[PDB]
Amino acid sequence: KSLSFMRVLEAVRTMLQEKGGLDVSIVMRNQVEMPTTMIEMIDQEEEWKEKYRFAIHHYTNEQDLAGVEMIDTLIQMGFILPEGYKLVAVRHCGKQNLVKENTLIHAKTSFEVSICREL
Amino acid sequence: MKSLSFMRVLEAVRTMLEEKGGLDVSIVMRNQVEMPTTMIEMIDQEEEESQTAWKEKYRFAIHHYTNEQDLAGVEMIDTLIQMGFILPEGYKLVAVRHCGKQNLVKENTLIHAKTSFEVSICR
Amino acid sequence: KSLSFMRVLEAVRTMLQEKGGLDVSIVMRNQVEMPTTMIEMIDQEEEWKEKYRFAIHHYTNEQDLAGVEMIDTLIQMGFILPEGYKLVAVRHCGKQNLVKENTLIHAKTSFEVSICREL
Amino acid sequence: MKSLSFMRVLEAVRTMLEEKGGLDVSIVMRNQVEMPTTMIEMIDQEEEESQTAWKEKYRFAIHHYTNEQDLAGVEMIDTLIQMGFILPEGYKLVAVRHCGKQNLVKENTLIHAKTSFEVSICR
Amino acid sequence: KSLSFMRVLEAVRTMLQEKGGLDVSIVMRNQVEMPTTMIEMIDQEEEWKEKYRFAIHHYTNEQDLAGVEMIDTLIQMGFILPEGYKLVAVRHCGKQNLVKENTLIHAKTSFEVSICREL
Amino acid sequence: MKSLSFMRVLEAVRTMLEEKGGLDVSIVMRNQVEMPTTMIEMIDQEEEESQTAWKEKYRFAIHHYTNEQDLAGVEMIDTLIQMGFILPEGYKLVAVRHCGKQNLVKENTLIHAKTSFEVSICR
Numbered sequence A, C, E: 001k002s003l004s005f006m007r008v009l010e011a012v013r014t015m016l017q018e019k020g021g022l023d024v025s026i027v028m029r030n031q032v033e034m035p036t037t038m039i040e041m042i043d044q045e046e047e048w049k050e051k052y053r054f055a056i057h058h059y060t061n062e063q064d065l066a067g068v069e070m071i072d073t074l075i076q077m078g079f080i081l082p083e084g085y086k087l088v089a090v091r092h093c094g095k096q097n098l099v100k101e102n103t104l105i106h107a108k109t110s111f112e113v114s115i116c117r118e119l
Numbered sequence B, D, F: 001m002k003s004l005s006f007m008r009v010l011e012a013v014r015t016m017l018e019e020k021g022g023l024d025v026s027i028v029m030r031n032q033v034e035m036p037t038t039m040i041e042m043i044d045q046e047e048e049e050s051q052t053a054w055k056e057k058y059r060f061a062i063h064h065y066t067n068e069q070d071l072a073g074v075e076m077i078d079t080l081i082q083m084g085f086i087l088p089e090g091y092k093l094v095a096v097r098h099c100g101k102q103n104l105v106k107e108n109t110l111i112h113a114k115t116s117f118e119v120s121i122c123r
Helices: A007-021 A065-077 B005-021 B071-082 C006-022 C065-077 D006-019 D069-082 E005-020 E065-077 F006-019 F071-082
Strands: A035-048 A049-059 A085-091 A097-101 A104-117 B036-049 B055-066 B092-101 B103-106 B110-122 C038-045 C049-060 C085-092 C097-101 C104-117 D035-048 D055-066 D092-101 D102-105 D110-121 E036-046 E049-060 E085-092 E096-099 E104-117 F039-050 F053-065 F090-100 F104-105 F110-122
Touching: A007 A035, A007 A049, A007 B071, A007 B103, A007 F039, A035 B103, A049 A065, A065 A104, A065 F006, A085 F039, A097 F006, A097 F039, B005 B036, B005 B055, B005 C065, B005 C097, B036 C085, B036 C097, B055 B071, B055 B092, B055 E096, B071 B110, B092 F110, C006 C038, C006 C049, C006 C065, C006 D102, C038 D102, C049 C065, D006 D035, D006 D055, D006 D069, D006 E065, D006 E096, D035 E085, D035 E096, D055 D069, D055 D092, D069 D110, D069 E104, E005 E036, E005 E049, E005 E065, E005 F071, E036 F104, E049 E065, E065 E104, E085 F039, F006 F039, F006 F053, F006 F071, F053 F071, F053 F090, F071 F110
Parallel strands: none
Antiparallel strands: A035 A049, A035 B092, A049 A104, A085 A104, A097 A104, B036 B055, B055 B110, B092 B110, B103 B110, C038 C049, C038 D092, C049 C104, C085 C104, C097 C104, D035 D055, D055 D110, D092 D110, D102 D110, E036 E049, E036 F090, E049 E104, E085 E104, E096 E104, F039 F053, F053 F110, F090 F110, F104 F110
């Protein structure tokens, strides 16, 4: 079977939290007022091989190159998946933004991951 | 050897989730949701290349609205759909794929989960 | 020459009416309040061979699998065209929807038809 | 051997429908219509591959607004356009095709018919 | 190096003004009330060879085939560029419109130009 | 051999325009501008095919708002960016291209100039 996107979201959140000590939410929200990091799942395509695309949203009061890049690097190093599923590649793909929304610096980083399952 | 209508496919999936899953799912997409619910949204349908037969792809999405995060419920639905559903004699479900938009977003006071599928059916 | 889309609309309506006893309108309308069936022409492409794409909109107070599928089946069986033009194929193509609009169940079914003319 | 301007093509078509059809047609698209009228809407223009010459595709649409269904009138226009229209010396109308959006829709109190063409012109 | 789109805009304006005696603005404006001719740059792609796409907007109180076509012809004949850059081709490409906006006849003509530089 | 984050690329460009150009440029895109300013808007990032290495394309746009036409300033920025910018050890700037939307438009009381680039970076 193919892993639910939500399972993938959870694995990234757990990695960010356990490996980076970061507090990341897996639910996308439109209106944001205080600093926060959310993961936004975008789409999925089965190519035993699959691609998931999601973006990391990092809101901060000031430009946070260090934090954004910690996250970027953490994700690129990988994350554990449930038995039978293996992360095979991580790459940047799609929209990368840095914009001022409300009073906050909003950084959006888009990833594509390739995941293999047992056949 | 007539091409199956989308609604027949809607029904096949709804019936399976009810019978095999005990879940109540609507096959009518609603644009204004203000309470938890599970809906199937049909999207499109296309012929697929078939050497030896007639193959067709149907795309639809499952919309799962809940008061809060519900990974257990989302995965239940997701896994049942991938396990397949019975079709009328002459039609063979060839493959069930995640394909297209996958979302987890807050809407007012609901968590909105959206899972997109593409199924291949042969005749 | 190539048949006007409207001529094709008329031939489908006549088929639905004469072969299915259904009352179908060939004019697309946005706001719909009472049960009805309309044909919506979408586009046309000349490939002596041509493709027309149109959708059938079936509004009912309750889910109407029987009615929707009668129509679906009627259309798939074909319809007569003016002399010199022959329907060669009918297939599902594009958006297929089932949505609740106003108080009505709105079913949209999209078709592509291939039509040949004398050369 | 200069590429023909869209307006020249607009004029060629308008002139034909008037001269051969006795129809009054505008070459100016209007976004706010509240009475019956026939308009040509120019859309786009592209080079086409030509081995031996210079070929170009022009796309435009005929907008036919009437108080009610008018298949006779729509077909009159449609048939004249497919029969061709004369162009300046050096340019040969190679083909007239239905291509793109074809619509029949109600707008307020008018029936709006839209027919899309692609013409190939060679030089 | 590659020529800035603005440099290309300026060269077309100078050509229209010096070769055609026309008064053309290189700044696109949304709301237009009096007759005018503006150039609207759209996009650019490097293929030593490059393509620029821009549209000419010609607003007049009455249909102006003569004026529109003078411009069309002027542009097709070419325009001079700064040393090291040569216009190699001009062709129609993209949206060509004739619409009534406000009280004015708005003509939009889209061009693609190929420009070569020294290597 | 880790893929470079967009922000690192933003910084590389900003730093160059400041150090080599004496220009003050923001790397934060603002949706509501009411005074002259120069901003870099990051757009997207994609892998590029590499035979022998790892190549990646980054796209961004320079937004130059001024009280009036400023060809001198637009060209200054444009030329510096094409001259390149230094990157961290291991990454080689392979090419700087104009690519995508290029605009010169009036917005309220400002002239808004938009220049779109694609850069290829290798590792």
